[PDB]
């Protein structure tokens, strides 16, 4: 079905954010696992998988709309050097991703691509859940102290 | 069954305390969950539910005694700004509630409303168990330190 | 995540309607049960529980958006004096509630808070189902007669 | 298998009656559900499904006989404004349909299409069962009164 | 609940499209079965059932909004004479239906009938799935050849 | 029970057709199996068994009517030497068989042998199902091409 | 455990190849699904998943050896425009990947990193299986023809 050209550009921009998130969260997961913080590693692993599922739905939507999904262009990963930095890097990416999602929804609404809007809204609901998780983790570090926070994330 | 006027006024006073407690505990619960202290959140939620069940029984007793349950007048919530304050606010409310239950029981005894007395005694038993819980939590904070106390209430 | 201030105000306004509805429907339920109209009493109980669940979600969303949920201010309960009036009081509350929901959705849309909109839409679907039910009950009173109508709501 | 042209025309006339009945019963069903007369709505829904099944078999037979089934021409629906009228409208359409079934059967027999006759007889048995149901409901309204009759059709 | 007059007119237009789709897909289904192309016949049968379910929901919504569902007016069916044309006919109807859905959604949004919008968005999602299926079938005919395409749809 | 003499002659004529059909379908089945077209072979085997079952019921009916079943006179088998011809031979036998069933039913009706008519009508329904199958197969050969058609009948 | 710097550089090159293959295979899978060639789409999906698991093991090994896994640099995807080209692009990438694996194993052996060698041998065994599959598909296209080959990959 011939999609709006600018909807497809937006969907490829969201997909681009997802490709970054996939790799950043996957690498953060494996860093946490290497460090023995397996509860963080498992949780971050699942965040990566959730982004992979989002990327799947975007690719499928783009192809249905007769566009070309862009899996070639990979933007800058934000990799922290300790747990607090890694969490803040994830949060910075999520905030950029939800900004882009909102702008994409605005355009989908204006050209009446209501199904593309519904897909982007569901992804945004997932991203706002991730934002809640990250903000909460960063606050927990302040409330229980870093050493306890990390201790609580050693074991699944 | 036409009840004693003052008994009903006592019952509506206790109900008023329950309405405060329901809302104060439900908000405390959701604050703790938002902060990632989910064990505190879950326990405080169950405390809110317990007060909801108490209020149901009081509403049911008032109506049987042919009074009008007061669900309109809501007293002042005591909302803390941190965990220790929230626990102490809960404790302050409970001590007021148990005072009011004792005075009402006295009056039920005097006019021989023994069933109302039994209901109130059952509620007083639950409220003393909550007081036990709250005093114990405040003591644990002193014994294990606030950061360890919070750490131990992150996960369920 | 720092929410829009007027979104938070709208959500607190929706929460305020829910707090009225919780108490109004609970009192109506317990009145219907006291009069032996247990089918009405049960259905109205479930309506109260539904509004409790909506309020929980609103409180959670407001806290996520870094606002203060208002559980202190209780508006005016509309309590009927017979079955027909009780149903009309519920319907009047519901119609005000759905007005406020739509205005809140407009504002969410305007500031691109699409997740808050989606939550309000879901609540709105639930409230329109309650209106359907209430309008239907009031029509049934006219079609079968009040005595038949009450007879049909004695037993669960 | 090349069928008799007038058999096919007769089958299309029966199909045409079924298309009317499908929509008339379905709308009557949803009206009754909207009014809270859910037992009438459920029964009328199953009448509508029964007519859909009859229409399927007719369409299949027509195509086997190398005719063109006519799903384009929709006759006048008879929609009531109250329960008694809706039942009488169904009954009126049923009497038209069974008259038409009888005439088609005569013709099938004359040209020795005994299989088409067998199908139409089965449909006729179903329609006479619907007539019994309809006549019985209209009789019950007189015997128990309209308000009791509707009361008895509120709940499934 | 009094609905917006133009929303109801839009809902009746969508319903009118569904009534065409129901009969057009059902006839196509039974033609394919008659020809021994049973996998197309089964798939098109389920398409027709899906439209029936959409029509039910539209009818229920129109009645709740105190409108009169229009099951009397039946537009032009598009019936192919071979498998390609039948698929192209379905696709032509679907493209008309989704245009009308988008216009109906616009009007629900403008009058704040967000629940009608949600229903229509769900139907639109289903229609775009059917469009994907249709476009894919027409593409496969080109990729595998007409004879193989039909061969692959003889058996379920 | 003494039957009408001409009914019994008609039943023996139908039995004679079945006896032809049993052997022709059984041999076509085993030819197809020998050729590796096992899906045709299996289906033709079941057509043969169906005819065996019809012949049983006719034999049983003739004996009840105190006639002598003729299992001695076997008419000409129509045996093809290729798939299309075998199917066309089956179709030609069926059309001759259904002609005879129609004339037999006419006579049973005339002399009021309504049970014999019902038996023959049931047999006629089965033969019209076989005619549908055969006509459909021949049509499929034209739509998908002979080589694909046979390919699709290699495997069960 | 401090690894050989050149081993890590090899591992990172292999990882680079995996990242290309993940995205190339995932896009090809979703293109095939969009074209209705679901058996190809599903098989290609499983190939993508396989490369994802390889990448995971390489990342984990690089971190164990105190290197930095490179998930930032994405080489050129080879995307076909039709099925034959897509398979040939997969095969060309695989032949590159296995050449790089052999040179990395040579180096692991020379510096006695026998565990890294064993991991790479296991990945090489998987890639040779994928090469077997791809060469076999391209041969099938020649043996059965493109139309039959594609037809055989429509359905799972
Ligand atoms: C375009 C980029 C990618 C896409 C679209 C993608 C997609 C997917 C999908 C759809 C799944 C299945 C999830 C499920 O159903 O539970 C999955 C699983 C997985 N992915 Fe990815 N992925 C991508 C990149 C990556 C990368 C770069 C890695 C590793 C660095 C990776 C590692 C994994 C793993 C380990 C699994 C689980 C496999 C299993 O079941 O054992 N993915 N991926
Ligand atoms: C008049 C004040 C209230 C009364 C009398 C009341 C009563 C009840 C009762 C009887 C239950 C069932 C508990 C059980 O037996 O499991 C319940 C459940 C619940 N209440 Fe309330 N309640 C009140 C206010 C509230 C408020 C203000 C909230 C939220 C702010 C709330 C949230 C809930 C929730 C989430 C549940 C659990 C529902 C479920 O089963 O999932 N309630 N309430
Ligand atoms: C030519 C007109 C129609 C035909 C031939 C037809 C045929 C059918 C058939 C064969 C079934 C399956 C029944 C079963 O065995 O369970 C069915 C189901 C149904 N039909 Fe129709 N139908 C028609 C029109 C309609 C219309 C106009 C509506 C709504 C206004 C409708 C609503 C339904 C529903 C709700 C179902 C049940 C689906 C489910 O199982 O969830 N149908 N129809
Ligand atoms: C007067 C002629 C025949 C009559 C009345 C007759 C009748 C029957 C009947 C009643 C059955 C049982 C059907 C069932 O399983 O439900 C049967 C089965 C069968 N018939 Fe015949 N049959 C006749 C001729 C033939 C011929 C000529 C052949 C082979 C050339 C044949 C081969 C078979 C086979 C293989 C079975 C399946 C038996 C089994 O495996 O249980 N029949 N027949
Ligand atoms: O990331 C990427 N997404 C893509 O679609 C893509 C490429 N497409 C090739 C192509 C295919 C078809 Cl079918 C039509 C026109 C085309 O140009 C090529 C390289 C990289 C990418
Ligand atoms: O919280 C509240 N409890 C109540 O009973 C109540 C109200 N009563 C109405 C009423 C009903 C009947 Cl049946 C008899 C006498 C009455 O006055 C009104 C507003 C708020 C409340
Ligand atoms: O209904 C009510 N909802 C509320 O949030 C509330 C109150 N908040 C206290 C508070 C806590 C924090 Cl952490 C930050 C700022 C604050 O003012 C106080 C009384 C009644 C209510
Ligand atoms: O209700 C309807 N039934 C139908 O058959 C029909 C139509 N037929 C098209 C057609 C197909 C073939 Cl294969 C042969 C000859 C034809 O004319 C067209 C519009 C509406 C209808
Ligand atoms: O397709 C149709 N949909 C309809 O509602 C309809 C009809 N309505 C009759 C009616 C009923 C009531 Cl209760 C109130 C006012 C009315 O005019 C009549 C014929 C055909 C149709
Ligand atoms: O793909 C990538 N893999 C990586 O390791 C990586 C980055 N690492 C940052 C870093 C972390 C630590 Cl803990 C120590 C030293 C460092 O420089 C940065 C950007 C992109 C990538
Ligand atoms: K009665
Ligand atoms: K083929």
Q: Which of G73, G64, G63, G77 is nearest to G16 (CA)?
A: G73
B–C CB contacts, 8 A cutoff, strictly below: 48
Structure tokens at C75: 């508006």
Structure tokens at C115: 């997740």
Protein residue whose Cα sits closest to atom 13 of ligand 8: E81
Residue G79 near ligand 5, beta carbon < 6 Å: yes
By CB neighbour count within 10 A (0-12 exposed, 13-18 middle, 19+ buried), where does D6 fall?
middle
Neighboring chain G residues of A30 at a CB cutoff of 8 Å = 56, 59-60, 63, 69
Give the CATH number, domain containing residue E87: 1.20.1260.10
**Backbone dihedral region for residue B36 (phi beyond 0: left; psi -120 to 50: alpha; all else: beta):** left
By a Cβ cutoff of 8 Å, what residues of chain A touch chain E? 1, 64, 112, 114-115, 118
Closest-CA distance of chain A to residue B138, Å: 16
Q: Best of E126, E128, E130 to disrupt the A interface by mutation (most A CBs within 10 Å)? A: E128
Structure tokens at E51: 């439209």
Secondary structure, 3-state, chain F: CCCCHHHHHHHHHHHHHHHHHHHHHHHHHHHHHHCCCHHHHHHHHHHHHHHHHHHHHHHHHHHHCCCCCCCCCCCCCCCCCCHHHHHHHHHHHHHHHHHHHHHHHHHHHHCCCHHHHHHHHHHHHHHHHHHHHHHHHHHHHHHHCHHHHHHCCCCC
Q: Which ligand is nearest to the CA of E85?
A: 8
**Quick check: B104 and B120 in contact, CB under 8 A?**
yes
- C-alpha distances (whole Å) from D120 to each of C49, D45, D72 are 53, 22, 21
The span from the CA of E58 to the CA of A96, in Å, is: 39
The span from the CA of E31 to the CA of E16, in Å, is: 23
**Quick check: F51 and F21 in contact, CB under 8 A?**
yes
**Quick check: F147 and F111 in contact, CB under 8 A?**
no
Structure tokens at F14: 């139908």
| Chain A: residue whose CA lies nearest to G24 | A71
- Contact call for C1 and A135, based on CB within 8 A: yes
Residue E63 near ligand 9, beta carbon < 6 Å: no
- Contact call for A125 and C112, based on CB within 8 A: no
**Quick check: A29 and A44 in contact, CB under 8 A?**
yes
A–G CB contacts, 8 A cutoff, strictly below: 48
Q: Find the angle CA(A48)-CA(A50)-CA(A54) to the nearest 5 degrees.
A: 115
- Residue B110 neighbours by CB under 8 Å, 6+ apart: none
Helix axes A114-144, C114-144, angle to 10 degrees: 110
Structure tokens at B144: 């294990």
Structure tokens at C87: 């149903």
Atom of ligand 5 nearest to the CA of A68: 5
**Quick check: C143 and D150 in contact, CB under 8 A?**
yes
The span from the CA of G44 to the CA of G89, in Å, is: 13
**Nearest by CB to F148, which of E36, E37, E147?**
E147
**Backbone dihedral region for residue D74 (phi beyond 0: left; psi -120 to 50: alpha; all else: beta):** beta
Q: Which of D72, D75, D47, D70 is nearest to D58 (CA)?
A: D70
- Residue G149 neighbours by CB under 8 Å, 6+ apart: G83, G137, G140, G141
Indicate the helix (H) or strand (E) that contains E35: none
Would you list the DSSP string of B71-129? -S--------SSHHHHHHHHHHHHHHHHHHHHHHHHHHHHTT-HHHHHHHHHHHHHHHH
Instruction: Give residue C108's Cα distance to chain centre.
Output: 20
Residue B146 near ligand 6, beta carbon < 6 Å: no
Q: Which of B9, B122, B12, B128 is nearest to B74 (CA)?
A: B12
Protein residue whose Cα sits closest to atom 35 of ligand 1: G53
| Chain E: residue whose CA lies nearest to G148 | E144
- Contact call for E35 and F148, based on CB within 8 A: no
Residue count (chain G): 156
Protein residue whose Cα sits closest to atom 4 of ligand 1: A52
- Residue E99 neighbours by CB under 8 Å, 6+ apart: none
**Quick check: E15 and E62 in contact, CB under 8 A?**
yes
**Quick check: G82 and G76 in contact, CB under 8 A?**
no
The span from the CA of D112 to the CA of D55, in Å, is: 22
Residue F71 near ligand 4, beta carbon < 6 Å: yes
Atom of ligand 1 nearest to the CA of G53: 35
Residue count (chain D): 156
Neighboring chain A residues of C115 at a CB cutoff of 8 Å = 121, 124-125, 128
Three-class secondary structure of residue E94 per DSSP: helix
Q: What is the dihedral of CA B102, B108, B111, B113, to 10 degrees?
A: -160
Q: What is the dihedral of CA G133, G136, G137, G142, to 10 degrees?
A: 170
Would you list the DSSP string of C86-113? HHHHHHHHHHHHHHHHHHHHHHHHHTT-
**Quick check: B156 and B39 in contact, CB under 8 A?**
yes
Q: What's the first-to-final CA gap in chain G, in angstroms?
A: 46
Indicate the helix (H) or strand (E) that contains G155: none
Q: Which residues of B87-119 are buried (b: 16+ CB within 10 A; e: fewer)?
A: bbbbbebbeebbebbeebbebbeeeebeebbeb
**Nearest by CB to G72, which of A31, A60, A77?**
A77
Helix then strand count (H, E) for chain B reads 5, 0
Instruction: Give residue E56's Cα distance to chain centre.
Output: 13
Structure tokens at A153: 């994330």
Residue A23 near ligand 1, beta carbon < 6 Å: yes
Structure tokens at B50: 């317990």
By CB neighbour count within 10 A (0-12 exposed, 13-18 middle, 19+ buried), where does E40 fall?
buried
Chains E and D make contact, 3+ CB pairs within 8 Å: yes
The span from the CA of C80 to the CA of C37, in Å, is: 15
Range of the domain at E87: 1-156
Q: Best of D62, D114, D119 to disrupt the F interface by mutation (most F CBs within 10 Å)? A: D114
Could you count the other beta carbons within 10 Å of the beta carbon of residue F49? 14
- DSSP summary character for residue G72: S
Instruction: Give residue F33's Cα distance to chain centre.
Output: 20
Tally the domains of chain C.
Answer: 1
Could you count the other beta carbons within 10 Å of the beta carbon of residue C52? 18
Atom of ligand 4 nearest to the CA of F55: 5
Task: Give me ligand 9 centre to Cα F59, in Å.
Answer: 59
By a Cβ cutoff of 8 Å, what residues of chain D touch chain E? 19, 23-24, 26-27, 30-31, 33-34, 56, 59-60, 63-64, 69, 71-72, 74, 76-77
Q: Which of D17, D91, D114, D110 is nearest to D58 (CA)?
A: D17
The span from the CA of E124 to the CA of E130, in Å, is: 10
> Tokens 């209780």 identify what position?
C74
Neighboring chain B residues of C46 at a CB cutoff of 8 Å = none
- C-alpha distances (whole Å) from F105 to each of F8, F53, F94, F112 are 12, 19, 16, 10
Three-class secondary structure of residue A114 per DSSP: helix
Q: What's the first-to-final CA gap in chain D, in angstroms?
A: 46
Resolution (A): 2.0
Q: Which ligand is nearest to the CA of G48?
A: 1
Residue D15 near ligand 3, beta carbon < 6 Å: no
**Quick check: G90 and G134 in contact, CB under 8 A?**
yes
The span from the CA of E41 to the CA of E25, in Å, is: 9
By a Cβ cutoff of 8 Å, what residues of chain C touch chain D? 136-137, 139-140, 143-145, 148-149, 151-152
**Quick check: D25 and D82 in contact, CB under 8 A?**
no
Neighboring chain E residues of F151 at a CB cutoff of 8 Å = 151
The span from the CA of D130 to the CA of F95, in Å, is: 37
Helix axes G5-34, A38-64, angle to 10 degrees: 40
Q: What is the dihedral of CA E117, E122, E128, E130, to 10 degrees?
A: -140
The span from the CA of E21 to the CA of E49, in Å, is: 10
Residue G77 near ligand 5, beta carbon < 6 Å: yes
Protein residue whose Cα sits closest to atom 41 of ligand 1: G53
Structure tokens at E61: 């919504």
**Quick check: C28 and C80 in contact, CB under 8 A?**
yes
**Quick check: F78 and F92 in contact, CB under 8 A?**
yes
- Residue E53 neighbours by CB under 8 Å, 6+ apart: none
- DSSP summary character for residue E112: T
- C-alpha distances (whole Å) from F80 to each of E68, F22, F97, F133 are 62, 15, 18, 17
- The CB-based long-range contact list for C107-112 (8 Å cut-off, 24+ gap) reads C107/C4, C107/C6, C107/C7, C107/C10, C108/C7, C108/C10, C111/C4, C111/C6, C111/C7, C112/A102, C112/A105, C112/A106
**Quick check: D19 and D71 in contact, CB under 8 A?**
yes
Indicate the helix (H) or strand (E) that contains C45: helix C38-64
- Residue C149 neighbours by CB under 8 Å, 6+ apart: C83, C137, C140, C141, D151
Q: Find the angle CA(G55)-CA(G59)-CA(G61) to the nearest 5 degrees.
A: 115
Structure tokens at C74: 């209780």
């Amino acid at each position: 079905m011939k999609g709006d050209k600018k909807v497809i550009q937006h969907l490829n921009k969201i997909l681009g954010n997802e490709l970054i998130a996939i790799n950043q969260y996957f690498l953060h997961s494996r860093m946490w696992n290497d460090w023995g913080l397996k509860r963080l590693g498992a949780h971050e692993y699942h965040e990566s998988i959730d982004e992979m599922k989002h990327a799947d739905k975007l690719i499928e939507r783009i192809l249905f709309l007769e566009g070309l999904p862009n899996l070639q262009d990979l933007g800058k990963l934000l990799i922290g050097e300790n747990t607090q930095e890694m969490l803040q890097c994830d949060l910075n990416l999520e905030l950029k991703a939800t900004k882009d999602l909102r702008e994409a929804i605005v355009h989908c609404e204006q050209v009446h691509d209501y199904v593309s809007r519904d897909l982007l809204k569901d992804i945004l609901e997932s991203e706002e859940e991730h934002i809640d998780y990250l903000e909460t983790q960063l606050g927990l570090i302040q409330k229980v102290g870093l050493e306890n926070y990390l201790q609580s994330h050693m074991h699944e």
